[PDB]
Amino acid sequence: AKTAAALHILVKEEKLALDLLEQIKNGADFGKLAKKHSICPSGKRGGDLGEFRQGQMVPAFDKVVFSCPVLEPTGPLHTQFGYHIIKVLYRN
C-alpha cells in the first residue's frame, strides 16, 4: 500500500522473543511491551512509528506486509538485526 501504520518491537535474540511471545498471551499489551523491552532510542518512536512507506526502516517489512495482511499482527520474524515483531494497520 502507499503507507502503513505499524507497531514494532525489535528483539536482540530469540530467547527474549520467546519470553515476549509468551508474555503477550499471558499478559497481552503490544504497545506497553514495546515500551518495557525496547529500551532503545526507537522505543518511544519504534514502539509507534505511525505511518511510513516500505522505504524507511527495513526490507523484511515488505516480506511480512506481503505475508499477513493489515489488521493481523505478525512475528517475531527473522531479520539481520535480530527478530522483528510488527503490528500492521492503516496501510493506505
Curated annotation (Swiss-Prot):
Pfam families, A to Z: Rotamase_3
Molecular function, one GO term: peptidyl-prolyl cis-trans isomerase activity
EC annotation from Swiss-Prot or TrEMBL: 5.2.1.8
PROSITE patterns: PPIC_PPIASE_1, PPIC_PPIASE_2
Chemical reaction(s) catalysed: [protein]-peptidylproline (omega=180) = [protein]-peptidylproline (omega=0)
Ranges of residues in domain PpiC: 1-90
Presence of keyword Cytoplasm: yes
Repeat as UniProt keyword: no
Subcellular location: Cytoplasm
Keywords, sorted A to Z: Cytoplasm, Isomerase, Rotamase
Superkingdom of the organism of origin: Bacteria
GO CC terms: cytoplasm
EC top class named in words: isomerase
Signal sequence range: none
Regulation: Not inhibited by cyclosporin A or FK506.
UniProt xrefs under Gene3D superfamilies: 3.10.50.40
Family to which this protein belongs: Belongs to the PpiC/parvulin rotamase family.
Name of the molecule in the record: Peptidyl-prolyl cis-trans isomerase C
The organism's taxonomic lineage, starting at the top: Bacteria, Pseudomonadati, Pseudomonadota, Gammaproteobacteria, Enterobacterales
